[PDB]
Motif scaffolding. Structure first.
Motif, PDB file in Angstrom:
ATOM      1  N   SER E  38       0.828  -1.195   0.000  1.00  0.00           N
ATOM      2  CA  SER E  38       0.000   0.000   0.000  1.00  0.00           C
ATOM      3  C   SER E  38       0.867   1.252   0.000  1.00  0.00           C
ATOM      4  CB  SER E  38      -0.942   0.029   1.204  1.00  0.00           C
ATOM      5  OG  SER E  38      -1.568   1.295   1.316  1.00  0.00           O
ATOM      6  N   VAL E  39       0.353   2.291  -0.655  1.00  0.00           N
ATOM      7  CA  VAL E  39       1.089   3.544  -0.765  1.00  0.00           C
ATOM      8  C   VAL E  39       1.347   4.136   0.612  1.00  0.00           C
ATOM      9  CG1 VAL E  39       0.405   4.065  -3.115  1.00  0.00           C
ATOM     10  CG2 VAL E  39      -1.119   4.628  -1.232  1.00  0.00           C
ATOM     11  N   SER E  40       0.388   3.992   1.528  1.00  0.00           N
ATOM     12  CA  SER E  40       0.562   4.540   2.869  1.00  0.00           C
ATOM     13  C   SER E  40       1.755   3.906   3.571  1.00  0.00           C
ATOM     14  CB  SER E  40      -0.712   4.328   3.685  1.00  0.00           C
ATOM     15  OG  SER E  40      -1.011   2.949   3.797  1.00  0.00           O
ATOM     16  N   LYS E  43       5.059   4.959   1.917  1.00  0.00           N
ATOM     17  CA  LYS E  43       5.480   6.314   2.254  1.00  0.00           C
ATOM     18  C   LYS E  43       5.999   6.390   3.682  1.00  0.00           C
ATOM     19  CE  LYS E  43       1.760   8.462   1.286  1.00  0.00           C
ATOM     20  NZ  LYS E  43       1.064   7.208   0.900  1.00  0.00           N
TER      21      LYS E  43
ATOM     22  N   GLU F  18       1.386  15.366   5.266  1.00  0.00           N
ATOM     23  CA  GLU F  18       2.361  14.496   4.623  1.00  0.00           C
ATOM     24  C   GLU F  18       3.613  15.237   4.181  1.00  0.00           C
ATOM     25  OE1 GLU F  18       0.452  12.780   1.242  1.00  0.00           O
ATOM     26  OE2 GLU F  18       0.357  14.666   0.126  1.00  0.00           O
ATOM     27  N   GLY F  54      -5.790  14.639   3.336  1.00  0.00           N
ATOM     28  CA  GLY F  54      -4.574  14.078   3.898  1.00  0.00           C
ATOM     29  C   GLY F  54      -4.099  14.831   5.122  1.00  0.00           C
TER      30      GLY F  54
ATOM     31  N   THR G  37      -3.454   1.567  -8.824  1.00  0.00           N
ATOM     32  CA  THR G  37      -3.466   2.608  -7.811  1.00  0.00           C
ATOM     33  C   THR G  37      -4.817   3.317  -7.815  1.00  0.00           C
ATOM     34  OG1 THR G  37      -2.465   4.694  -7.125  1.00  0.00           O
ATOM     35  CG2 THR G  37      -2.385   4.136  -9.461  1.00  0.00           C
ATOM     36  N   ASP G  41      -4.633   8.928  -3.509  1.00  0.00           N
ATOM     37  CA  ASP G  41      -3.205   8.844  -3.238  1.00  0.00           C
ATOM     38  C   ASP G  41      -2.388   9.443  -4.373  1.00  0.00           C
ATOM     39  OD1 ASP G  41      -4.111   6.944  -4.924  1.00  0.00           O
ATOM     40  OD2 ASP G  41      -2.978   5.273  -4.065  1.00  0.00           O
ATOM     41  N   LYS G  44      -2.503  13.125  -3.954  1.00  0.00           N
ATOM     42  CA  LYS G  44      -1.690  13.442  -2.784  1.00  0.00           C
ATOM     43  C   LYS G  44      -0.211  13.446  -3.143  1.00  0.00           C
ATOM     44  CE  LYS G  44      -5.043  11.372   0.359  1.00  0.00           C
ATOM     45  NZ  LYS G  44      -5.538  12.662   0.902  1.00  0.00           N
ATOM     46  N   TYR G  45       0.220  12.452  -3.921  1.00  0.00           N
ATOM     47  CA  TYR G  45       1.601  12.414  -4.386  1.00  0.00           C
ATOM     48  C   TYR G  45       1.909  13.616  -5.265  1.00  0.00           C
ATOM     49  CZ  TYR G  45       5.844  10.710  -6.686  1.00  0.00           C
ATOM     50  OH  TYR G  45       7.121  10.580  -7.182  1.00  0.00           O
TER      51      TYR G  45
END
Lengths: 114, 67, 93, 109, 67, 92, 67, 67, 114, 38, 67, 67, 67, 67
Positions: E38-40, E43, F18, F54, G37, G41, G44-45
């Motif tokens: 998972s991306v979470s 990261k 983040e 986020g 994906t 996310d 967010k990236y």
């Protein structure tokens, strides 16, 4: 490395399947002389009957080794599967990341070319 | 036999994180596969093994306070 | 406790959006039209209602009570301090 | 049933003051208000800008007039939006239209 | 060896985010597949390995107030 | 109990994001980035920030600093006064 | 080496939104599947990378109040 | 490239709504597929890219009240 | 352009697969002369047995490029893929967006036209 | 605290619709679009 | 093109409602499928298209009261 | 077209209710399917269409209460 | 013509509830599937159609009370 | 004809919940499967059918109390 985006994954998969499947075969004689490679060995059973009854039931060893480590392997030289020894009868063309080494038993029969 | 255990587990963690936790392998009639763990439990397993083994201290005790 | 009350009252509400921050401020709160960093100040006019689309939201934080037992706790501490000092509690506090 | 939209009229998009001036013109067509203008090559009478004489823009009209108007009023200073001001159809480049009044007190936002 | 796998994990994250983390590859009876993440977790793994290694400061310690 | 109340009151809000902590505090708490010292912020008028998904800024409800501690003090003080032989009102 | 990453990620998001983020590829014996994906996310990236890179002003903080 | 990007994205959105968001294309021997996206996320992406673009008025500032 | 709503999709699929797994091929000679295309090379293996026994080992390389650029290629011309040089023997008919290219090895054997 | 109370009170209601803002406010809040300043 | 887009949306909604949206077609060697949108999403899209286009009144404002 | 469209929609509702909403149909080599809607959405579509068309009503005022 | 539709609907209810609604029939190379509705909506349709048709009374007006 | 179908239904319920509700039947190239239903729905259907048909007494008007 190569303009594929796919052969890289192919090579990684080939390395993984070599690691998880197959044994370490060492080569004798030839230009490679002594060298150790990892390959998946199989030996299907084949039978021929010829005349009335001439059952000559035998085996067709294959190794499926990467071409990079077996470049210019020739055919005359022999091979050893640990305690057992063979000799390369033929080499398949590469499919993209490796090929198949087809082996015979015993000693290669002469040369018979000139 | 704890240091090499730690090394192997940490390497497995890193490769699973990046790309290299192979699950299934197939050889046209000779195929197998392995079960997969979770990132969180693998991390806590790493932490448990490192804290139980003799490597350096990684966590202190609570936190003092003063005006 | 004074600083905690200050900060809790400081940030009344928040806005969530995917647009540019300046555009979000203008289209959810208003103002802009500046004469010429500091973001953008907002006039305190009459009551207003903004417009929203999916992914855009306004959430007003309720904070919390500013005297959750603090008064009675400091009352007890003042009882103790008066007892120590020898002066009457009422005179001290 | 029958509802329209009323839009507030503001020629200025900034706190830059705008100022006006009067000058003789040689207009040949009915010119609506706030139209770009330049000078004639020969007699330098004022005339609505064509859009191909790049760098010839001098000012923007103030009040509507026609051929009969011996003199006209225009704006020498000020910032104006890109859309509220009409343009000759010959000037078909957005960048050219925006940069037409570069080098003077007339600016386009 | 810290920065090497830092960069490797960052590149893997960029790949996964963009388009081409190879889930599985097969060719004529040669099928393999790799476990996904998972991306979470990726990261947070990036962040913690960055903290462990000697990368420059990215996070700080609260923030005081003053009138 | 006094120390615990100090801590609970001293921690009031939390911000999570983040991206970089410095930039997050600049874009959420205002801060004085134009000037670990972190980023102390001014105390002006009421302010409302904007946050993309986020990120989240949540204040802490804390906890009542005298949840029965006064009554416990009452009982303990009366016991101490009884032991000392002086009256509770005189002592406390 | 972050601006080209930003451009690649933006292009990937655009094509994924419209029609063009391929999941599987099959050529009569060779097949490649890519991990799927999400959009949250991914953006967010995009936001984190654009704010960290040398991208210009796009975000402002709190708000002032006055009468 | 904002204008043509917007046009292509809007056309793809309309096609997805109507009948022609092709999930997979299969010709004998060659099968591929594109990832599938939600609709609300696409709509909000369209809206945000529009407001980023220098197109016409699309939003207004809160609302005024008067007796 | 395509009155199918399917031809565009299949062409997109072919382009994507050629991009993500194919390789560059450098056509030589012919009207296109020196030019570069992208094709999915493969080398399936085949064996023939002449007489009582003759193990003539070979392969049948194929490229499967899109038809639009493969037009006007004929048969006499040759092809070079990376470091390997081949020569077109046959072009399969268009499937809608592409076609297979069958390759020999080395120089085409004469012309023998008239 | 006074400013916080002011801002909390000054918003009251909030509308949300993917429709265009002007038409949405006309159809929901009534508005006077038949007669910037929003 | 708004009017013909609206007509296409109306026809698509009618087909969806009754019987006539094809999820996939197959011709023993060629087959293609399409993602299925939600009926509520289609209704919302067609309604907002009706409102935005030059179509006549569909919805009035809030209803006041009188005694 | 509204009247015959409504009649066709009612017939389709009846067919789906009983047995006749064909989910998929396949012959040798050729196979297609039609995405199936629910019942409540179809019936509310029927109701709203019957209301909006000009035939006799089925909806009245709220109520009336008298002692 | 409501009576024949009611008869068809009740027959479908009966056969589906017992054993005799075929969800799909697969003749070799000739197969078809029909969407399977529930019993809830089916009896809802039964009730609404039987009450809208001029058949016998099924329900009455509330209920009085007396000492 | 209520009695015939009621008896058939109850026998079908008994057989199905004991062992013998044929969900699907297969021949060489012949596949036929029927829809399946829960047990509560058919039980309450049987109850309502029996009570609506002129069978023997099965339910009684509430239950009173007395000292």
């Amino acid at each position: 490395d190569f303009d594929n985006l796919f052969d890289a994954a192919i090579a990684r998969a080939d390395e993984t399947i070599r690691g998880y499947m197959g044994t370490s075969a060492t080569i004798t004689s030839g230009e490679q002389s002594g060298a150790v490679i990892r390959g998946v060995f199989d030996d299907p059973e084949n039978i021929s009957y010829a005349g009335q009854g001439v059952r000559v039931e035998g085996s067709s060893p294959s190794l499926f080794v990467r071409t990079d480590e077996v470049r210019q392997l020739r055919r005359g030289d022999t091979l050893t599967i640990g305690e057992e020894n063979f000799w390369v009868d033929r080499v398949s063309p590469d499919d993209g990341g490796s090929c198949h080494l087809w082996l015979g038993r015993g000693v290669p029969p002469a040369v018979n070319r000139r | 036999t704890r240091q090499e255990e730690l090394a192997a587990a940490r390497a497995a963690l890193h490769d699973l994180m990046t790309g290299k936790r192979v699950a299934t392998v197939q050889k046209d009639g000779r195929r197998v596969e392995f079960t997969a763990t979770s990132v969180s439990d693998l991390k806590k397993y790493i932490a448990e093994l490192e804290v139980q083994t003799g490597m350096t201290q990684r966590r202190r005790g609570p936190a003092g306070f003063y005006v | 406790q004074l600083q905690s009350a200050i900060v809790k009252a400081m940030y009344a509400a928040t806005i969530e959006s995917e647009l540019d921050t300046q555009s979000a401020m203008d289209f959810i709160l208003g103002a802009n039209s500046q004469e010429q960093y500091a973001a953008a100040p907002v006039r305190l006019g009459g009551a207003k209602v903004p417009h929203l689309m999916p992914g855009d939201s306004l959430n007003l934080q309720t904070a919390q009570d500013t005297d959750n037992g603090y008064s009675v706790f400091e009352q007890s501490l003042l009882r103790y301090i008066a007892a120590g000092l020898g002066v009457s509690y009422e005179q001290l506090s | 049933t029958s509802k329209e939209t009323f839009t507030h009229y503001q020629p200025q998009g900034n706190s830059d003051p705008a100022h006006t001036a009067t000058a003789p013109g040689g207009l040949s067509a009915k010119a609506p208000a706030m139209t770009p203008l330049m000078l004639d090559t020969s007699s330098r009478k004022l005339v609505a800008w064509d859009g191909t004489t790049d760098g010839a823009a001098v000012g923007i009209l103030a009040v509507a007039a026609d051929q009969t108007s011996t003199t006209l009023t225009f704006y020498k200073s000020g910032t104006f939006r890109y859309e509220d001001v009409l343009w000759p159809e010959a000037a078909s480049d957005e960048t050219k239209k925006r940069t037409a009044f570069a080098g003077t007190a007339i600016s386009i936002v």
